[PDB]
Amino acid sequence: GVEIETISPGDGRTFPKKGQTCVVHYTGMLQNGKKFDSSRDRNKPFKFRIGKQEVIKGFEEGAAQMSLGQRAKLTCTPDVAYGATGHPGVIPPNATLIFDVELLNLE
Amino acid sequence: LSKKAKASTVDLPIESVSLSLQDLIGYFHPPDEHLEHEDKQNRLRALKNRQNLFQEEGMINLVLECIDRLHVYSSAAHFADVAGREAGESWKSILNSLYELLAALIRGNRKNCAQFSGSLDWLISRLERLEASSGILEVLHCVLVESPEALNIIKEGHIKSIISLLDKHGRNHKVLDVLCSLCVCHGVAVRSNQHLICDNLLPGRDLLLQTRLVNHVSSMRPNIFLGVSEGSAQYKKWYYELMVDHTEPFVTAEATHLRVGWASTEGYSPYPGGGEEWGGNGVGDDLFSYGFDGLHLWSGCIARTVSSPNQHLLRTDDVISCCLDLSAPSISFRINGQPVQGMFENFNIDGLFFPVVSFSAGIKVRFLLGGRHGEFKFLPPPGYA
Amino acid sequence: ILELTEQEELLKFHYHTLRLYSAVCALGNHRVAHALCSHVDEPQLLYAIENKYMPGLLRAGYYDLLIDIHLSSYATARLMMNNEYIVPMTEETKSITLFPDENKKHGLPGIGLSTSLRPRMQFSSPSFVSISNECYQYSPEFPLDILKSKTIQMLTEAVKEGSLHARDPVGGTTEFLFVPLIKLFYTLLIMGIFHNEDLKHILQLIEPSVFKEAPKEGLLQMKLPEPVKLQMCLLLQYLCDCQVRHRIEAIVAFS
Amino acid sequence: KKSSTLQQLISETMVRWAQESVIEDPELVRAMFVLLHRQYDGIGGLVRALPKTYTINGVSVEDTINLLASLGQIRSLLSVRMGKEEEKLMIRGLGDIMNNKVFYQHPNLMRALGMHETVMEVMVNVLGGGESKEITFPKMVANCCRFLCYFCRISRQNQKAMFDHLSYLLENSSVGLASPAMRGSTPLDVAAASVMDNNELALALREPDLEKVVRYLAGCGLQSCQMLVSKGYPDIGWNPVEGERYLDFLRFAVFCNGESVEENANVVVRLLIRRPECFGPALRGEGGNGLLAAMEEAIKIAEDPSRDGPSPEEDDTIHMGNAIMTFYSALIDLLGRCAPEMHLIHAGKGEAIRIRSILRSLIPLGDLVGVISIAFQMPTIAKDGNVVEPDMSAGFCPDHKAAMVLFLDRVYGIEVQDFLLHLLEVGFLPDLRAAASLDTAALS
Amino acid sequence: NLFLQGYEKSWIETEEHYFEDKLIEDLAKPGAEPPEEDEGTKRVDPLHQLILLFSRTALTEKCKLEEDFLYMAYADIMAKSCHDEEVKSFEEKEMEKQKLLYQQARLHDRGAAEMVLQTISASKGETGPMVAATLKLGIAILNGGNSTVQQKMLDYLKEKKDVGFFQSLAGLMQSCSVLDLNAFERQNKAEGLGMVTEEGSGEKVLQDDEFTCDLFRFLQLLCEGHNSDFQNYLRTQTGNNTTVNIIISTVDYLLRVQESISDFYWYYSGKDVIDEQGQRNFSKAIQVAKQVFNTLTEYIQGPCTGNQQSLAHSRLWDAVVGFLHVFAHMQ
């Protein structure tokens, strides 16, 4: 349920492995074009370990499919992103989220 | 009248009721601000005593009964049909005056606003109707600011009705003020109402005005103005190239903007058409320009993903070649010598066309317009001047 | 947004929208503050902070929204226990003295080694991709150093601008120029972000001659409006409270 | 030269502004003159600051930090209205505070931080919310009352600080007395803990407060329990469950450290005889069957399911018979404790003589002898051998007779050997024989 | 910790500095008024603004008079400024009287009398530190029988038609305390037990002797100097819709304090020696009774025939026949 449109190419050899923290700069957006989150806005890279169930799953598969240094557009369907309940106060119910994700570094 | 008795036989003190309501509004008029302190305090004391006596005699319920009996009739025309012409014209004014009197009776007095607690639920039930929206909203504001028990009474459905008032009646800052009063009362905040107001108003992003921090975008164009017309000596095919010497993907928090392509002018005036001079708009953000960002064909501020071998956002050392056939309206692109699989076709040819590029910051590009000015990295398509 | 200076209806509606944003996050609703960080983010806040052409009402609303969303809960926390003095009796506490040196001259208020127990700084980063709920504890993080530098730079410029009695203060009136900026400065001082040389510079701004370390007049003699005078009184009261706390610490050290 | 001091600078600028312009904003004038007064009364600054100054060693710093954070959370709950999640927040905060060792080691710091009045204010706000409508969030109220009682028991100075707020507590005495499993967690319990086992505090206790309590007891004796009849309990005229609580408070008020506070006992007896409705229907004096008849009828009621239970261990099923028995037992215990001391009665003080005479008139000897003569049901092993123990709180309790004995020995005086042997044979010997029979292993 | 508390209560409290005169003198100075841009009437001086704020706070309608730290601070400051407290000759006597007149002028020229009447009226007859400080300030500005201040207060009361002032005076009179022999016996048994109460002073007997003496010194100074018009006003408030007989209320309090003194005597009838606490209670109660008697004497002097008849028909004679017995036996 996650698609990858490559804005910028990556090395193509290095990918997120199990138990490895992936740092990314993401710019979350709704389909209508509005923005709800941006690690670039806070000027702090977002730091998460893949496969440890800490981020929305669709973002997780998108990052896993990404490669080092690659910049890609992650379209996350409502099932893989916040579901029918939606994130209260930010994400409306049954919302599809598109992210501009860049894999800054892999560790 | 409700028992369908004859209107002439029934007596309705229409004029005297309005005159007395004006008298009561004057009698409960709040003291004027510029008055001296002592006189102001005396008049507040008198108003407080008046409200106390009226509430003890139970005038609030009488006013509520009159308001209910007037709301029995849906519209001014309906009241004019069930009653006399004079009642028809006075229905709106009397109903507004009653709400003004209710607000005057409850305003500033804590005990009256506390006794209004039972009637909060009934009052909000008529918030949607236009003839009483302003008066009901004012009464609600007074009760909320004065009585904490009103905040206890207000429920999720009442908050949703107040919010839907914004959706149906448009933007009104008084509804926002009422919602603010709901959140905090006398230095005490209610977590339930805060959460409900947030979770119901904010996520939609359709009622409150939205904000974003957007980069400025500027457009550079050559002096040429090429167009197509019958019996006019212009070569319908044209070709030019642009190379990105340097580009920064993120100079600011927002992504950099770099689009290349053709643009047209409404009429024969040299001003580019359909776009504002300054702002965040660039090539393709109107139906007068046509752009290529490296991944999307931009026209009318709508982007479509166009395929291309090793498609990427326009980066350093990228040579973009633009094509224009005015014989059959068609704009084609070709990045690094290989063609992208997208075309702008059957667009308007009334006006003149010219090359244009849009950039925001950190952009370093060079026009290659052919001949002495620029030397084409790639060979122009056959017959393209 | 700067085009609203001439459209009164949208200006008023957006000012009330900003005040509603403040109200929903008022009194430490950390969850609602995290939610609001999406609608109004850090770059938007800072640009509203610094822009000189902003309408007065929007400027006043934005300086309050920033305070309420990011730095209000800790400000109230440290302000609530400002009258209690639990002083650990350790060596750095024993080192405290009433006067900085042998000469009996008062040191600059605030600057010094204070050992009294004090609430703990803690902020949670708002990330909506995260599914964790522990971030709803504490309030959203903000660049407290960039904010500090910007606040002092803006106040330094504002002192020079006001002395000139310029036709156009930022926001249209001297009140809109000063009172919200002074409010943000006071909030930062209450949080105690300012320290050492930075606090020395801001004290020199407040009054050069008196706080000159051991010309251009300060705010206390620059013919301020009454709304600004109240915030000046608040700042001076905080300075007096800092001196009282220093006295209490020195008494505990002597004991 | 320049002022060179913050004090002089403030004193100059405040006066300069005030004489420069007519300040119209009242808050500005107030702030300016408050600041000027602080400058001119700097020693007063230390006068206010020092009481709220405490010192701790290095080892307790972390625990003090955690307790200060918990107190900050509890104080922050004041600014918001009470709610379901606020209940969780308060309860976890108070649990943390009670677990902190500094809470025990430094009671003076705990008092100086004034958390005691903070919890009290939270109580006031929540009690005011839904005043007549029982108590919303009853568990949170129970937790606050438990914390306050424990704070009273920590130290005597804390107990004095608690007793300082007795008037409000008695104003809100009737909050959750009727509901069981709320017992030990009501404001009346906090009042009892504040005036518990402290002779100085018992002497300081005033007469109007006792009058308020006695009026509450009269209301309980006259009017039924509406919350219980709402649950479907049979409607009798008086309120035994709440009356027992109100009598227990008076017991703690009049009996301190083994002796009996004479000043409080005399006032309590006088009020209780000015309004005889508090004694209950058995001893109102008109149509009164008597204490022994009341006990027998209560045994019958407790054995019957229809009266003892509502039928549309106590919070689920308040036993009407046990409630009546414990009410009368508490009343008798209160009277016996209010009886004057034997040293004074032998010294011949007329007031002590008179109070003894009044109590003797109030309660006849034969009724007490009969109540003592009432026997106890013996739990029995079944044919399986498993012991069939009826709920002890359902029926006639040994403490019920313990109160009887206390009254008997403190008002009459066991001085006749014939009466001694009579009481022995009728009530004392059979119970001790029953204990002898129960001395078997399982029955032990 | 023990050292901190002892140091506080032994040194910091006992430290005394006399700044009130300097503060009031500075606050009364109009500073560079012509250089200041008035272009008309002079700006009210800072003391005038402070008094105006304190007056408006009282004039604002509230259900209760909220205790204000600013008011208890500045009221004591102004009272000390007014007072500024071997045999002095006539020159010294006259200089002191002239000094006190000017010191009282610095306040009553700026509405201090109106402020002290308004605070008492807004008290609604509730005893508190607010009204204790207000009464002390009133005594300060009326000390010596300041005819100008008496005239200002009487004129203000007449033109405002104020009934709350006299209602609050009455209510304060009923709220005033007397000897409580029951409390004395309870505290004595506590002392016999030996456990010193956390409140070591133990002045529950005669709760507020200073407040009672101040309340009655105020009323005596109000009629001081044979102010016959003000005495008649106190007896019957002519213009006001409802009147309160302050003369009768005063003698009612005198009767209550007489009964308290008589009971305390009768409790010490048997004991051979009066204990120190008994002597202190007698010392305070006798002073209170003396102040009430002097207040009544100032009521009835200046042959105020109305007051004379009102007290002649009052319960005064019972208090008189009681004090006669007390004096007959205590002598």
Author numbering:
A (entry chain E): 2 to 108
B (entry chain A): 436 to 820
C (entry chain A): 1641 to 1854, 1889 to 1929
D (entry chain A): 2053 to 2364, 2377 to 2508
E (entry chain A): 3618 to 3702, 3710 to 3955
Please quote the authors directly.
Ryanodine receptor type 2 (RyR2), an intracellular Ca2+ release channel located on the sarcoplasmic reticulum (SR) of cardiomyocytes, is essential for cardiac muscle excitation-contraction coupling. Structurally, RyR2 is a 2.3 MDa homotetramer consisting of two functional regions: a massive cytoplasmic region, also known as the cytoplasmic shell, which comprises several regulatory domains (NTDs, NSol, SPRYs, RYs, JSol, and BSol domains) and the stabilizing subunit calstabin-2, and an activation core and pore region, which comprises the Ca2+ binding site and the transmembrane domains. Dysregulation of Ca2+ handling, characterized by aberrant SR Ca2+ leak, is a pivotal pathophysiological mechanism in a spectrum of cardiac disorders, including heart failure (HF), atrial fibrillation, catecholaminergic polymorphic ventricular tachycardia (CPVT), and other arrhythmogenic disorders. Here, we solved the cryogenic electron microscopy structures of ryanodine receptor 2 variants linked either to heart failure or inherited sudden cardiac death.
To induce reversible oxidative modifications, S-nitrosylation, and glutathionylation we added H2O2, NOC-12, and glutathione, respectively, to the purified RyR2 protein. However, the reaction time was limited to 30 minutes to avoid aggregation and denaturation of RyR2. Treatment with H2O2, NOC-12, and glutathione also rendered the cytoplasmic shell in a subprimed state, slightly more downward-outward than the control (RMSD = 0.13). As with RyR2-S2808D, we were unable to detect any additional cryo-EM density to attribute to post-translational modifications due to the limits of the resolution obtained from the cryo-EM experiments. This was because of the reduced number of resolvable cryo-EM particles (1.4 particles/micrograph for the H/N/G condition vs an average of 12 particles/micrograph for the other conditions) likely due to RyR2 aggregation induced by the oxidizing agents. However, we hypothesize that in vivo the membrane-embedded channels would be more resistant to aggregation and denaturation and a more pronounced primed state could be achieved thus increasing the diastolic SR Ca2+ leak.
